């Protein structure tokens, strides 16, 4: 959008700190007004020395010095509260937006891009909102006052200095366009540097195993070189732009001098001398304005990237139905789905009904769409064709927070936080549960045995993503996390992929006790864990080719019979 | 260590940019010397107006303006070059260290801390290395010259101004200590904020499924509030620190004034007046020095944080043996291992020999230590008790780069990069392989069928960590990546956990053709894929309880018989 629209929207975040901003200006006025007083009283003491009591002058120095210090403290301290408060408000707004963005947003964006926006882009708007305003108001008023002051003595001579106003306006406009474009390139380049570093840290084991240290070094060297080159190009533009405006001023002054010499007749000192002296006070304010033009555009480009994320569309939440507890009946009716931005159809026509106290088993080859179907019930991705009804109400009529409270999920990709074992099991809505409840859930997931052997028991830290645990132990913590949540609907997405047969039997036996009070949807590749399911759905290329029980599907010679053995 | 040592070590990175620093100083000297010339020529032109040709003054104005612009451009551009070069060198040094740090370093540190160190801590050293030096040199020389001038005029009066030096020194020392501590706290807080943001971004699905948006919001709010409070505390400390030094200076000046009045006898103007005038030039340099101490200490803290990582111990690389190709014989002899910082024993006594063209199967319950045993061959973790020999040479005698070239690894946790399928399959040492080789490798891993159906074929982007693919497809891509590398030794760590029976059969059939020319170590929980292994090792609680073939282990009634059915 327009650069003025972005800047005015940025100033809306400085409104709560208007009172603190005025104190900073008042404090700096006290500091500035002291300098003439100290110098003036210094001269009086000196003059008295050469020549009705001056013995009070030494005492007055301390008072004015203390008065100067109070003004300096107010200016510096209360200006930081405006700058730090503005940055803090933007960071909180950016992070709270991350918790409502759709899943498809995180799939098409790197983590380094998002981290850099909250860390680096926010600091780029500090100067444009605090220091830039003071300079523009102060030096801007000085230039306007001087031009009115010059017009008073001689309007004919001011026409020469007015003729260079258009050329400065064109030059300032052209330079501002470059600064905004160059700042946008710099923030993207900084995001690329963070993206390379984040990717290498996440996959250091792949880099360490298959070689590629030379490949990773070159990739980061190019990313860092571009960031340095683009930052250096901005400085070169700024370092030529400021001196070039000064040369325009002095060229105009040179033309003014020639006219005065030719116009020296019919006049004398006191009128032409005053005009030349006044005209010489213009270069200094213009230099200050030039050096702040880069800062303003740097903030404008930074705020544009910040406001792009804040204006991004969140997941649809137009529902209003809230229920304390649902029966758990799940029904899918003629559902078809394709991922956004993709023309491939993942699900063609799905129809099944799950009654309370039942298991529905989802089996098939890899890539059939079993995880996609289970990811539409919690409304991770929006569906357009078909209906998904939970307890007779379409899942789009529930509120998002209320809908996800009734569904317990065990994803295929197990993710854990860098915290204690007890904190990982009781996370979010179930946080603060009694330790007895946590241990009961862990016992059901066959996880109490290895937890008790940890150095600190349930308080042991698992490290980053649970790296300090084996693959099967991480997965059993994810199962325990979902069992504590209870919920009428439980979806298991390959919950025993990293477990042996003995651990599977213990978990499968413990899952029969939660059979009666909930509806379970199981996606499994080991068919021995779903042999007691009420309904088994065999899905191939997005269509449920076969359905029935274990005996019915075995008698029929189809995909299930071949997959079973 | 000492702050002086850290600061001197930091200046070692500014040595390559000494010439640019001198050019910047020369340019700024050219800029500074112009102002008196312009003022004097303006005064000369004004005086001639009131009253042997002055018509060249306008041209001299333009010439001097151009000279001033050239000086300003040189100074600004080359100072920016020095700062950007220093930052780039520090970032490149930091990133290259990440590629040699041990696995245990990444296991005990968050990615957010490492990302923040390369991004935020590096920018904290610019001022202390570029702007601090000029101010310190200039104002220190000014203060020393002023003190010598005062001592020349009257040494008796200078004793009063000498008596305030110790209090200033003590005050500056205390302020510097506080500044260093506060800078360390601030950078730690920024690392915490980055860690919270990265953790929330990485595990957004868990946050979205189990609730906890309020929990994450509160955690990030606390982190940001702590960071803001610490920065505000530093600002308050500095803003109280400077005016207090000014007040000390002015108290000393008041005492001097009181002494002068009593000493007015036996003297007159020209000696006492000069002393008072000279003594009044001291507050400004001391004020300039005070405002730069905070920058120096902030840079010192940042440099200390950087040098802590740069001095971290890398993985041991004392070996020297290099081989172009090894036979592939693997032998483990009386190996025992415990993870660093942990008193629990993972492996007790392991002994097995793998001949070329053989399969060794590792089976057992979860947490037995199979991945730990498989992770010692590539020397991911250092072992102390026992010997691991590859082709009759202990694995610690090989160079790390040469040793890992002979081993192809399929880790349990599949990790992919945000790039094309072909780039993921051919990564690192095998980069640049012909497309025919990549397609042949993908065909063996039963991955060509689903790759050919992608929108762009082999050039399709898989997204962050391959999120745009199902788990089985990612695992098959990892298998293809490992198969392309060839290598005499191949280790598979649950390579078929996320695959159905048909894909498992296809991959197992394709793996029999690579049987003859390599030695294969397989860690499997699905025992149907290792029924044709030459040797099967059943490991329980870190000990190989049973060994033999499928028929031998089935005839014996032990752990394998129970695990099989
Ligand atoms: C609504 C906002 C705009 C409306 C009002 C704008 C008018 C601004 C009036 C400010 C006039 C005083 O100008 C002010 O002078 C002091 C020094 O003299 C400067 O202060 C500067 O030098 C001092 C010297 O110690 C430093 O402590 C300080 O860190 C530095 O910023 C301020 O940067 C400047 O802003
Ligand atoms: C080995 C290093 C130390 C040995 C040499 C140290 C002596 C330093 C001599 C420098 C004397 C000139 O001092 C220099 O003046 C100019 C302005 O007058 C300042 O420059 C400052 O104001 C100008 C005004 O346009 C701005 O363009 C510039 O961005 C800003 O930094 C420099 O910050 C200062 O360093
Ligand atoms: Zn992005
Ligand atoms: Zn799946
Ligand atoms: Zn850390
Ligand atoms: Zn394992």
Curated annotation (Swiss-Prot), chains A, B:
Residues 22-298 form the ABC transmembrane type-1 domain. Gene3D superfamilies: ABC transporter type 1, transmembrane domain, P-loop containing nucleotide triphosphate hydrolases. It catalyses: ATP + H2O + lipid A-core oligosaccharideSide 1 = ADP + phosphate + lipid A-core oligosaccharideSide 2. InterPro entries: AAA+_ATPase (IPR003593), ABC1_TM_dom (IPR011527), ABC1_TM_sf (IPR036640), ABC_transporter-like_ATP-bd (IPR003439), ABC_transporter-like_CS (IPR017871), ABC_transpr_lipidA (IPR011917), P-loop_NTPase (IPR027417), Type_1_exporter (IPR039421). It is an enzyme of class 7 (translocase). Its EC number is 7.5.2.6. Coiled coil: none annotated. Belongs to the ABC transporter superfamily. Lipid exporter (TC 3.A.1.106) family. Involved in lipopolysaccharide (LPS) biosynthesis. Translocates lipid A-core from the inner to the outer leaflet of the inner membrane. Transmembrane domains (TMD) form a pore in the inner membrane and the ATP-binding domain (NBD) is responsible for energy generation. In MsbA the ATP-binding domain (NBD) and the transmembrane domain (TMD) are fused. This is ATP-dependent lipid A-core flippase. It comes from Pseudomonas aeruginosa (strain ATCC 15692 / DSM 22644 / CIP 104116 / JCM 14847 / LMG 12228 / 1C / PRS 101 / PAO1).
């Amino acid at each position: 959008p327009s650069s003025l629209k972005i800047y005015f929207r940025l100033l809306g975040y400085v409104k709560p700190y208007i009172g603190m901003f005025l104190l900073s200006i008042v404090g700096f006025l006290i500091f500035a007004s002291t300098q003439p007083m100290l110098a003036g009283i210094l001269k009086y003491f000196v003059d008295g020395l050469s020549n009705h009591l001056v013995y009070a002058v030494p005492l007055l120095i301390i008072l004015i010095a203390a008065w100067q210090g109070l003004g300096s403290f107010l200016g510096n301290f209360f200006l930081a509260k405006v700058s730090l408060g503005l940055v803090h408000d933007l960071r909180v707004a950016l992070f709270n937006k991350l918790l409502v963005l759709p899943n498809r947003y995180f799939d098409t964006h790197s983590s380094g891009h998002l981290i850099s926006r909250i860390t680096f882009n926010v600091t780029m708007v500090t100067g444009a909102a605090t220091d830039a305003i003071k300079v523009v108001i102060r030096e801007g008023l000085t230039v306007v006052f001087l031009f009115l002051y010059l017009l008073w003595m001689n309007w004919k001579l001011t026409l020469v200095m007015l003729a260079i106003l258009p050329v400065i306006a064109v030059m300032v406009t052209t330079a501002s366009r470059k600064f905004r474009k160059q700042s946008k390139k710099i923030q993207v380049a900084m995001g690329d540097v963070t993206h390379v570093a984040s990717e290498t840290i996440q996959g250091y084991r792949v880099v360490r195993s298959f070689g590629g240290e030379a490949y990773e070094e070159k990739r980061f060297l190019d990313a860092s070189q571009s960031n340095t080159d683009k930052q250096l190009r901005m400085t070169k533009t700024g370092a030529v732009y400021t001196p070039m405006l000064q040369l325009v001023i002095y060229v105009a002054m040179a033309i003014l001098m020639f006219l005065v010499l030719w116009l020296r007749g019919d006049a004398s000192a006191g009128d032409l001398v005053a005009y030349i002296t006044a005209a010489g006070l213009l270069p200094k304010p213009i230099r200050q304005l030039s050096e702040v033009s880069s800062t303003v555009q740097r903030g404008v480009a930074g705020a544009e990237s910040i406001f792009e994320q804040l204006d991004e569309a969140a997941e649809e939440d137009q529902g209003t139905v809230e229920k304390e507890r649902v029966s758990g009946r799940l029904e899918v009716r003629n559902l078809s789905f394709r991922y956004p931005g993709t023309d491939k159809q993942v699900l063609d026509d799905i129809s099944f009904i799950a009654e309370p106290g039942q298991m529905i088993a989802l089996v098939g080859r890899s890539g059939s769409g079993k995880s996609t179907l289970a990811n539409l019930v919690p409304r991770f991705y929006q569906h357009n064709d078909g209906k998904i009804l939970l307890d007779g109400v379409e899942v789009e009529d529930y509120r998002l927070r209320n809908l996800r409270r009734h569904i317990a999920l065990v994803t295929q990709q197990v993710t854990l936080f860098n915290d204690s074992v007890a904190n990982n099991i009781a996370y979010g809505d179930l946080a603060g549960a009694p330790r007895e409840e946590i241990e009961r859930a862990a016992k059901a997931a066959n996880a109490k045995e290895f937890i008790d052997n940890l150095p600190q028991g349930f308080d042991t830290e698992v490290g980053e993503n649970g790296v300090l645990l084996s693959g099967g132990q991480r997965q059993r913590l994810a199962i325990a996390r979902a069992l504590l949540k209870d919920a009428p609907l439980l979806i298991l997405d390959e919950a025993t992929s990293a477990l042996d047969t003995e651990s599977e039997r213990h978990i499968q036996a413990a899952l029969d006790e939660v059979m009666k009070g909930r509806t379970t949807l199981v996606i499994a590749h080991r068919l021995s864990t779903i042999e007691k399911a009420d309904l088994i759905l065999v899905m191939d290329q997005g269509q449920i080719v076969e359905r029935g029980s274990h005996a019915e599907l075995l008698a029929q010679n189809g995909h299930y019979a071949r997959l079973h053995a």
